[PDB]
Amino acid sequence: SFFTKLTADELWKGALAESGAGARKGRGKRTKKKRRKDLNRGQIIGEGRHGFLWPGLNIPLMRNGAVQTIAQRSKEDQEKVEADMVQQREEWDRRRKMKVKRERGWSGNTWGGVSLGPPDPGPNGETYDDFDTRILEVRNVFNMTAKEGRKRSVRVLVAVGNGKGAAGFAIGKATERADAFRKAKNRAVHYLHYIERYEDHTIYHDISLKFKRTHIKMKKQPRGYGLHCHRAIMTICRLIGIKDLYAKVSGSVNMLN
Amino acid sequence: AGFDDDGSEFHEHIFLDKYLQDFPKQGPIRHFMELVTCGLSKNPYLSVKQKVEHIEWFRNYFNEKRVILKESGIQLN
Amino acid sequence: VDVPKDMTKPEITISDEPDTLYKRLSVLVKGHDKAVLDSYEYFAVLAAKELGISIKVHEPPRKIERFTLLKSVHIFKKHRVQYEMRTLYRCLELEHLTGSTADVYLEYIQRNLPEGVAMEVTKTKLEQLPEHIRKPIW
Amino acid sequence: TVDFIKKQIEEFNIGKRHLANMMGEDPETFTQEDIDRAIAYLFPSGLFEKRARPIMKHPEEIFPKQRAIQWGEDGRPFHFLFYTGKQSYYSLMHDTYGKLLDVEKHHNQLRAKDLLAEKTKILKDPIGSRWLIKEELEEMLVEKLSDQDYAQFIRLLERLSALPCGATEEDFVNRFRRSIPIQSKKQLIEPLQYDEQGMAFSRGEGKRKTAKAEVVVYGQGSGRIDVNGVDYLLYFPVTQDREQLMFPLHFLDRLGKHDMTCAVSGGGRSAQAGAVRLAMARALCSFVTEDEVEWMRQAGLLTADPRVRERKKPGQEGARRKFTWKKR
Amino acid sequence: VFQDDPYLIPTSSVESHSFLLAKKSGENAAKFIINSYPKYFQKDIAEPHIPCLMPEYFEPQIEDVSEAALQERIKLXXXXXXXXXXXXXXXXXXXXXXXXXXXXXXXXXXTWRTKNNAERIFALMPEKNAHSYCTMIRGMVKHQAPTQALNLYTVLLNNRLRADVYTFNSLIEATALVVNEKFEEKWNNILDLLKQMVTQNVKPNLQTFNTILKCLRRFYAFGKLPALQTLREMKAIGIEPSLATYHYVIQLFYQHESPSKGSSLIIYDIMNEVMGKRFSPRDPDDDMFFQSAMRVCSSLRDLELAYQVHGLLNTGDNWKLIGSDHRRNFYYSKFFNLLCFMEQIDVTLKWYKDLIPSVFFPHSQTMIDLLQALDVANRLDMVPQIWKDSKEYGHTFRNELKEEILMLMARDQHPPELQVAFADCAADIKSTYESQPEWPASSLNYVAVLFLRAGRTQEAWKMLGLFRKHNKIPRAELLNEFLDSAKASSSPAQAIELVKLASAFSLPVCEGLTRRVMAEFTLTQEQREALGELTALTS
Amino acid sequence: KNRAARVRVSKGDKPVTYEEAHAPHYIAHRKGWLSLHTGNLDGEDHAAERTVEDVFLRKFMLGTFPGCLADQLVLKRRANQLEICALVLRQLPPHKFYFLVGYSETLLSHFYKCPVHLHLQTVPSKVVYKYI
Amino acid sequence: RRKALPPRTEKMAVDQDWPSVYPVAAPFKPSAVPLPVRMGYPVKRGVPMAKEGNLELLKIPNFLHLTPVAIKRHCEALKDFCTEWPAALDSDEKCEKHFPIEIDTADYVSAGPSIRNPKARVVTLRVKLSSLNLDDHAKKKLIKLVGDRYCKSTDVLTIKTDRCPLKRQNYDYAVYLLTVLYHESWKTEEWEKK
Amino acid sequence: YYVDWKMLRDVKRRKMAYEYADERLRINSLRKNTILPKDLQEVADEEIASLPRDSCPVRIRNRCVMTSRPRGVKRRWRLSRIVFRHLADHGQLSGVQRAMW
Amino acid sequence: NHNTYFALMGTLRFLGLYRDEHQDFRDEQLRLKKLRGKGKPRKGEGKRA
RNA sequence: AUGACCCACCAAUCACA
RNA sequence: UAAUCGAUAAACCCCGAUAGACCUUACCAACCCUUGCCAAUUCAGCCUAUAUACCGCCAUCUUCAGCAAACCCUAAAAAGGAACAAUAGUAAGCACAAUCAUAGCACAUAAAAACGUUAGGUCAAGGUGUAGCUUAUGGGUUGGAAAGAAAUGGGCUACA
Ligand SMILES: [Mg+2]
Ligand SMILES: [Mg+2]
Ligand SMILES: [Mg+2]
Ligand SMILES: [Mg+2]
Ligand SMILES: [Mg+2]
Ligand SMILES: [Mg+2]
Ligand SMILES: [Mg+2]
Ligand SMILES: [Mg+2]
Ligand SMILES: [Mg+2]
Ligand SMILES: [Mg+2]
Ligand SMILES: [Mg+2]
Ligand SMILES: [Mg+2]
Ligand SMILES: [Mg+2]
Ligand SMILES: [Mg+2]
Ligand SMILES: [Mg+2]
Ligand SMILES: [Mg+2]
Ligand SMILES: [Mg+2]
Ligand SMILES: [Mg+2]
Ligand SMILES: [Mg+2]
Ligand SMILES: [Mg+2]
Numbered sequence A: 001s002f003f004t005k006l007t008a009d010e011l012w013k014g015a016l017a018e019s020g021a022g023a024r025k026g027r028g029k030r031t032k033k034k035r036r037k038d039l040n041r042g043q044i045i046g047e048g049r050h051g052f053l054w055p056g057l058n059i060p061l062m063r064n065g066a067v068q069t070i071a072q073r074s075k076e077d078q079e080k081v082e083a084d085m086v087q088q089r090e091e092w093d094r095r096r097k098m099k100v101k102r103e104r105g106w107s108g109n110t111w112g113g114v115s116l117g118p119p120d121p122g123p124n125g126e127t128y129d130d131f132d133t134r135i136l137e138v139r140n141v142f143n144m145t146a147k148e149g150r151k152r153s154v155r156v157l158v159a160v161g162n163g164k165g166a167a168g169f170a171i172g173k174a175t176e177r178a179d180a181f182r183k184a185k186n187r188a189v190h191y192l193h194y195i196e197r198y199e200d201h202t203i204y205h206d207i208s209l210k211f212k213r214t215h216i217k218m219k220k221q222p223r224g225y226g227l228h229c230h231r232a233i234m235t236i237c238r239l240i241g242i243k244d245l246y247a248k249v250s251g252s253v254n255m256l257n
Numbered sequence B: 001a002g003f004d005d006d007g008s009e010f011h012e013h014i015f016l017d018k019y020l021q022d023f024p025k026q027g028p029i030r031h032f033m034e035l036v037t038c039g040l041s042k043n044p045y046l047s048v049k050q051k052v053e054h055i056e057w058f059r060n061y062f063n064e065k066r067v068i069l070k071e072s073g074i075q076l077n
Numbered sequence C: 001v002d003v004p005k006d007m008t009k010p011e012i013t014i015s016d017e018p019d020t021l022y023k024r025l026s027v028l029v030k031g032h033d034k035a036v037l038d039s040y041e042y043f044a045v046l047a048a049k050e051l052g053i054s055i056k057v058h059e060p061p062r063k064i065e066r067f068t069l070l071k072s073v074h075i076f077k078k079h080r081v082q083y084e085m086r087t088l089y090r091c092l093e094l095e096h097l098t099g100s101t102a103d104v105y106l107e108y109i110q111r112n113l114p115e116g117v118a119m120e121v122t123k124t125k126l127e128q129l130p131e132h133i134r135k136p137i138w
Numbered sequence D: 001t002v003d004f005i006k007k008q009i010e011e012f013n014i015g016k017r018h019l020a021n022m023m024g025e026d027p028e029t030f031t032q033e034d035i036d037r038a039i040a041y042l043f044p045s046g047l048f049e050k051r052a053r054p055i056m057k058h059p060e061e062i063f064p065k066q067r068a069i070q071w072g073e074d075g076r077p078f079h080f081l082f083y084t085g086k087q088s089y090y091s092l093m094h095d096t097y098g099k100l101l102d103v104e105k106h107h108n109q110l111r112a113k114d115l116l117a118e119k120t121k122i123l124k125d126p127i128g129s130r131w132l133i134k135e136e137l138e139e140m141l142v143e144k145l146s147d148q149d150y151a152q153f154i155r156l157l158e159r160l161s162a163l164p165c166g167a168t169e170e171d172f173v174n175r176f177r178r179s180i181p182i183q184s185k186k187q188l189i190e191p192l193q194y195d196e197q198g199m200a201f202s203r204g205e206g207k208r209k210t211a212k213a214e215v216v217v218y219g220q221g222s223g224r225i226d227v228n229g230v231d232y233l234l235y236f237p238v239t240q241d242r243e244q245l246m247f248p249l250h251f252l253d254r255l256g257k258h259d260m261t262c263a264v265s266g267g268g269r270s271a272q273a274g275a276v277r278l279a280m281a282r283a284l285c286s287f288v289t290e291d292e293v294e295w296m297r298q299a300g301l302l303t304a305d306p307r308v309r310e311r312k313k314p315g316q317e318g319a320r321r322k323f324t325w326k327k328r
Numbered sequence E: 001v002f003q004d005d006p007y008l009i010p011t012s013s014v015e016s017h018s019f020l021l022a023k024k025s026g027e028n029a030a031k032f033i034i035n036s037y038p039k040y041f042q043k044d045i046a047e048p049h050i051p052c053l054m055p056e057y058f059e060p061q062i063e064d065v066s067e068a069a070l071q072e073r074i075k076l077x078x079x080x081x082x083x084x085x086x087x088x089x090x091x092x093x094x095x096x097x098x099x100x101x102x103x104x105x106x107x108x109x110x111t112w113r114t115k116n117n118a119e120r121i122f123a124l125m126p127e128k129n130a131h132s133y134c135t136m137i138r139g140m141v142k143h144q145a146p147t148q149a150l151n152l153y154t155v156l157l158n159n160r161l162r163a164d165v166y167t168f169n170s171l172i173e174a175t176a177l178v179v180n181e182k183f184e185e186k187w188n189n190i191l192d193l194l195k196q197m198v199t200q201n202v203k204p205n206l207q208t209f210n211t212i213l214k215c216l217r218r219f220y221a222f223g224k225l226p227a228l229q230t231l232r233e234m235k236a237i238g239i240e241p242s243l244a245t246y247h248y249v250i251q252l253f254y255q256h257e258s259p260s261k262g263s264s265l266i267i268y269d270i271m272n273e274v275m276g277k278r279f280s281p282r283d284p285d286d287d288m289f290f291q292s293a294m295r296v297c298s299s300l301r302d303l304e305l306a307y308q309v310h311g312l313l314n315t316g317d318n319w320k321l322i323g324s325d326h327r328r329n330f331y332y333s334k335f336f337n338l339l340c341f342m343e344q345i346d347v348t349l350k351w352y353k354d355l356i357p358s359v360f361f362p363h364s365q366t367m368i369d370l371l372q373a374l375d376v377a378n379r380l381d382m383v384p385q386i387w388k389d390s391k392e393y394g395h396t397f398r399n400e401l402k403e404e405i406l407m408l409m410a411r412d413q414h415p416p417e418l419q420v421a422f423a424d425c426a427a428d429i430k431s432t433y434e435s436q437p438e439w440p441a442s443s444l445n446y447v448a449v450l451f452l453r454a455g456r457t458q459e460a461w462k463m464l465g466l467f468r469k470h471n472k473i474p475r476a477e478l479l480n481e482f483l484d485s486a487k488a489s490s491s492p493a494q495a496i497e498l499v500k501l502a503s504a505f506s507l508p509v510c511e512g513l514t515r516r517v518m519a520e521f522t523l524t525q526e527q528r529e530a531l532g533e534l535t536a537l538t539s
Numbered sequence F: 001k002n003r004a005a006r007v008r009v010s011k012g013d014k015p016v017t018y019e020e021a022h023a024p025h026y027i028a029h030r031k032g033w034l035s036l037h038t039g040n041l042d043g044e045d046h047a048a049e050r051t052v053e054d055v056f057l058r059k060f061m062l063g064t065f066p067g068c069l070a071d072q073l074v075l076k077r078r079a080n081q082l083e084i085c086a087l088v089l090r091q092l093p094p095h096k097f098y099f100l101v102g103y104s105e106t107l108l109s110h111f112y113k114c115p116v117h118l119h120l121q122t123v124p125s126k127v128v129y130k131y132i
Numbered sequence G: 001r002r003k004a005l006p007p008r009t010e011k012m013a014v015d016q017d018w019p020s021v022y023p024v025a026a027p028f029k030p031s032a033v034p035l036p037v038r039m040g041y042p043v044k045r046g047v048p049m050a051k052e053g054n055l056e057l058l059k060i061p062n063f064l065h066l067t068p069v070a071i072k073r074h075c076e077a078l079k080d081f082c083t084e085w086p087a088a089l090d091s092d093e094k095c096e097k098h099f100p101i102e103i104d105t106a107d108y109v110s111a112g113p114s115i116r117n118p119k120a121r122v123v124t125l126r127v128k129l130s131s132l133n134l135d136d137h138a139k140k141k142l143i144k145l146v147g148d149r150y151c152k153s154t155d156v157l158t159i160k161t162d163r164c165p166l167k168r169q170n171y172d173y174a175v176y177l178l179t180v181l182y183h184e185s186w187k188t189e190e191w192e193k194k
Numbered sequence H: 001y002y003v004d005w006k007m008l009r010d011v012k013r014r015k016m017a018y019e020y021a022d023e024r025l026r027i028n029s030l031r032k033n034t035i036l037p038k039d040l041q042e043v044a045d046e047e048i049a050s051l052p053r054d055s056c057p058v059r060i061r062n063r064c065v066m067t068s069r070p071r072g073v074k075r076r077w078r079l080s081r082i083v084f085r086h087l088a089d090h091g092q093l094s095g096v097q098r099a100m101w
Numbered sequence I: 001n002h003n004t005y006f007a008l009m010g011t012l013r014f015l016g017l018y019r020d021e022h023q024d025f026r027d028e029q030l031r032l033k034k035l036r037g038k039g040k041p042r043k044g045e046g047k048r049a
Numbered sequence J: 001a002u003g004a005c006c007c008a009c010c011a012a013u014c015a016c017a
Numbered sequence K: 001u002a003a004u005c006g007a008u009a010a011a012c013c014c015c016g017a018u019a020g021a022c023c024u025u026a027c028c029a030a031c032c033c034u035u036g037c038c039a040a041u042u043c044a045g046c047c048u049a050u051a052u053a054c055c056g057c058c059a060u061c062u063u064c065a066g067c068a069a070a071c072c073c074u075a076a077a078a079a080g081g082a083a084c085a086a087u088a089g090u091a092a093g094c095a096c097a098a099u100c101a102u103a104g105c106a107c108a109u110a111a112a113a114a115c116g117u118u119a120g121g122u123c124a125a126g127g128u129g130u131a132g133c134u135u136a137u138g139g140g141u142u143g144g145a146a147a148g149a150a151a152u153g154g155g156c157u158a159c160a
């Protein structure tokens, strides 16, 4: 029965069932989750519950300038050691069950409004820590493939700006959400506009534009009247540095347009 | 190397006549036992001791049943 | 620079007995991969030329053993996997050797046998005649 | 990656010294040829793929060629075609076209001076000259190429060579020449042999399909054939096989003039007839003229027959024949 | 013995020790497991049947039967006595061999229990002397009570059983080792038991004359003359003198070698006859021979006889001729101590690379020797090498032998080729102590001077900066030296900084210092900054 | 699709040893044998014994040196002695390495009743042939 | 605390005698071998893997202990053990005229815990009949007696001995068999006249 | 633990069959012989059919040694076809390789 | 002998020399199973109760 | 000629003090 | 029938089996045994359920040529990205290709063939998630497993 056994990697790979056909077509629900815990995490070479102490492993090779002999711990000493290890496991379970807080953008389950933090340094060493990025719209998008059938890409639409009058937006698309985030950041920094700000809070004059089927209408406010706008426009404004504004959008509210 | 096999020599292997001394000389028992003998004569995997133990098991088993042999239609020693 | 002094202590004795003569001594090396047998051949020949042992070397035909198993755990009998084991040979044929020389050359050679190879030693030794046959007649 | 190459050469030289020492040879007269034998003996890997076996070689042969640095420390690219993305190839095209124009000018001046003094060097065909392959060119520019690229270039060289050839022009187009090696299919005649006061006997060895045949033919004899110590009418009862044995002799009209002994092993009857056929044919090439040798080859007398039994395959029946396939 | 990979190769002497000791602790752990659960290791495969790989049986093979369990549990010490007690409880008679074995066990294992066990040895069984006296005269040397042993020598001589060789050995040693104010009364009793042994038909062994020498060692430093006589005595009867004999000879001959150098010549000639021969180191005490045979050459500084001791070592069996690793490193410490100063650099550099990394690793004593060897022969080439080697083996000693190493950097004169060696060697050093290490101003004399012979001022400036940043200063000849190195290339601002930091720290040459910056600022025509300096010092 | 002893292509980040990057059909062509012994040759005996021995050695070694084993073991058998040769990550202090060397060699020597040698080659991190 | 020591290849003298380094059969530590050797299959741009950490070189039986210098030395040390071959015996003719009897004996070496090979028992006895003192009658009677063990073209008599545990036992039994064949070939009996 | 109860059964069987080999042989000598009378042979018959039923060799099965599989075994390695392939395909079986020809 | 292999490597695990990830996996799974409340019934208890 | 219904993408880690 | 299981369009049907009289063996019927293979363990043990939780091995499209990271472009992008007298694409990687094998080439054959598709096949190779049994769905012994109304697949031998 000793030969009958296996490697940890094999056993976990087995138990998790990540590679099955259930995971691929989304043949099972996302609320069902199980994880892999290293079973060597807290163990030391030489340690056993029989309680031995080996000269090279558990205990230092020389004590008081001489060679320590093979010896065994007392019953109660082993009791305490196992108590320690159990409390270590419980500590790691206490660490694992705590979920880190996600700052909520617009709504709790929306990615909209959320910050991605500064885009990544360009190849020349050029660095923007002055820029912030906000997510405007994340969307699961599909395409019908010859082999796989439905094929799910995320595409995100993002905006960056330094608050000093340069902002720009871009869109990015990938199989993985993380990947599209990266892509749209790094791409956004390439299309920047300069937005002229009157006295560095409002716009200069009233604006009305019909872009495709969307009508935006903005009005220039005095100093105290903060940011009364569609939530996306407020996000973008905060990125530009426009602090006082009024805008009503009519017709299609489609985000990219 | 390591195995001399009790310092025996090939004549304590090939020729087993010595242990057939006590056995009926003209009977079918000579036939049978000369076959067993000849078999052991060709057997590499066994020691001298073991062959002799086979021989003796037969001595003892035939001498165990005298009755069936006498009744058999041949008087056998 | 640093040389140990007087480093040699061989122990050899000569018994009065007529050391055994070997008419021919054949050594067959089986191995899996050729190259190792070639290196071994080189080494063996070299070792014999230095002892003045006068040898020949030839190559016996290679044996390939094949067999089949099922490719699947359960049922597709139509699909198989075939495995090989190739055994390659060298033959070192030595002639006109003595007993001692044989024991040395064989000791040296056998120690240095690489791990993936096997060896078979066929010694044909010379004996004049037995005693009881010489020229008595019963 | 330049420091790498330098170091690698240092340690290849140090190493070559070491190796030459253990192998007990003179470090100066050590060649690559010797390095190889030395490793092959020291690290004997049987592996069928020769590229996977142990190698100690000069790092220039081991490592692939590197595009050198393309610009100075200020950022200006050295070569004026840099921004094309292929400098190497388009330079070649540039200079080639330049030489073409040059040729046109010079030859036009010589047209106005009433001189055509040049010749057509465009036939190298006896040298067996060909163009570089795409692979070769790609190695000469240290740059990847496209099929249409290679095509373009070659077409241009053609345009060049089709005009009056200058000296520097001839030399130019001849970097792009290679010579295809020897093409002759003429056989290698067995030297005729004279043995023990006996004159004119030749040897040949046929192999067909598990049958091997060694045939010795005597020119000095009358017509008969002894196969494995018996008469050929006895050993080959079947007409067809006797006709096979007859083929080469009847072809050369030697049918009464030669006396042959044979050793044939393995295979069946027809395979042995085939074997002796081939061997006999190969033996009679010593006695005949060089032209009739070409004839025998063109009759298919001198070629071994490659056709051999195929291996049965698992899951089939006969090496081709498949198990019966049920649709439903 | 050690694993051959670079990671597991021992760097120092301490690492060699801990590594080898570790390996043995592992081997032990294994053997423990085997002998704890033998049934797992029972199943045999090997055809020639190695008996050596079989598990061992430390249990008694019979329980209640006395005559088995006694000897069984004796071969195994306390279970032996539990056994002899369970045999004496059943009224089973214990014979002359029984507690001769239990006695040899009381001598080999094991002050009240010795008296009790001895009392049971004599009272119950009337043991033949040749066993009982053997054990008790051996064990009461260990329990330190030799008198009752002379009483047992009387009781043994009474019964016609002669005292065997080890008796006269142990009692020659007992009458020797016991001396109260009077040595002659002892030595005479010794020569009397030595004559009494010759009369009793017992032939004195080589180890009896050897024991006698060992005894004559510990009392008089001039007791080498009787011992010398003994050294001739054995040579008359045909027994070849042991390396232990010769050792003790070299011990008293050394104690009398320090004031008088003639006994030295006698050790050297005794050794000179000893060394034309191939050894068979078969006696018990022999290590200290090759310890002290070479030890004398280190104090007397005589290299030829050390070449001879080495030719002796490498001859019979080199490996078998030195017992311990400490007593082994003494050998090379002293021997290479001789090789370094006494011989040409051609010889020293040679034996260096052979002995140092390969056999046994450099101590502090062999460290200082290489330093003094390169100062006299003027070798500046081998400094980076010996430093890099001394880094690997010599980590702990570093701080203490550091101040000496660098001192050989001042003594030289430095050409343009050697600049980079100084730069690297010193830079690694000070980068090691500025990242953690009290740092000498000597080291700055060196970086700054070697960088003046290098032609590099800019780094010597930053290094002087890094010492005045260490919250203490060099003496003023170094500050005047870099005042000069910054003056020759016309760098007066760095000179201003240096003499400002100099006048802040009180430096003794301050008259001469102020005079040197006034001179350099009169040479570069910085004079207004010199007057501003006088105005900054007056305030 | 044959799956046997294969390491499938991931997104292209996956580190793969020289061994793992070669499917069984490359044995004796590109990669070589992880064991060597006489048993599988034409006229030879006790193949089965050596196979079981092998399996136990891989398992044993994998458990005795947890986490520090780089690539699969190499087992050379020569004239009754087995030299085990391993690639080991540097994890443990050389104390633990020598302890385990000695412990192992003795233990296995007494188990299999033949002299066992152990040869450790030490490596900074898993040698990487491909992807990564 | 992480320790990395440079390889032995650094401290290696160019002319250092190699057999010093690898006296016995050795695993090939890359650290202790000076020669750069790349083995392994390459990758499309790349080269064969380095000698450090290379598992494939570890698999190779290495002839490094056997480098020809080391052999020359080894053999020259072995010249003392070997004994000379008698002059006159140089040709096979004289071999037979002097020694009639050839005894073939096999010895097998395979790696593993046990030495024991079943095939080792077999002893073969080859003897020319022309080297025997046989009468005409005795020769015919022996030929008929042994049968298949006699080759009529080459006149070489063959005795294959198996049946006993040891090769020495089998040697004795083959010799004995030969003896008895010769003694019982010369005895004429009653039925031989029939 | 043997991997399966079945394997256990088999181990026992091989033990018993080893133990009684001598008896079985000695008796089947009598049984298989034409020379002896039938009256001895019928008694000898009941004799060998008296012996424990798990002592007779035909009741033995060669099983995969690691995995206990009752068939699909290759006698030489005493291995199941599946386990054999699993070892050979990682190249842990010396001198075994895929076969092309 | 599978008993010797299983027994010996079990002990060597308890003496902390050998490390069995398979047995560890089995363990941790089982622990988490007794925690969730489905364990192995003490002998005799399960059916009738 | 015909071929219940139902099938799919809305959750985040590891490591150290 | 008291009396296994698994495969069961292509991609099952001399298939798991390169192998069942007892054994094998999982089934049926009687009987037995309950810390019950192991160093220890309120534990061993389970051919119990789920192949629609899986690893391992595979089948299949397939001798099909595509898959895929990192980028770049598009009066917006769901997605698309070639034109060689070239119009927006570069791309490492894996497949194909090349090499290796079948003892010389060549050809052939073998081998190889990615990503995915069929919740394809297999918890009875072994291992395992989840859920189940524990004086029984576990472990042993003895003996039984029949059979041909009919339908059919693949073979063998034939009809000369
Ligand atoms: Mg919410
Ligand atoms: Mg057919
Ligand atoms: Mg099971
Ligand atoms: Mg069977
Ligand atoms: Mg309908
Ligand atoms: Mg429908
Ligand atoms: Mg089922
Ligand atoms: Mg079904
Ligand atoms: Mg289907
Ligand atoms: Mg049945
Ligand atoms: Mg049954
Ligand atoms: Mg069941
Ligand atoms: Mg499925
Ligand atoms: Mg493609
Ligand atoms: Mg569009
Ligand atoms: Mg695209
Ligand atoms: Mg690509
Ligand atoms: Mg080929
Ligand atoms: Mg092809
Ligand atoms: Mg195929």
Ligand SMILES: [Mg+2]
Binding pocket: K112
């Ligand atoms: Mg291919």
Ligand SMILES: [Mg+2]
Binding pocket: none
């Ligand atoms: Mg299904």
Ligand SMILES: [Mg+2]
Binding pocket: none
């Ligand atoms: Mg199914």
Ligand SMILES: [Mg+2]
Binding pocket: K123
């Ligand atoms: Mg199961």
Ligand SMILES: [Mg+2]
Binding pocket: none
């Ligand atoms: Mg039918």
Ligand SMILES: [Mg+2]
Binding pocket: D323, K154
């Ligand atoms: Mg079929």
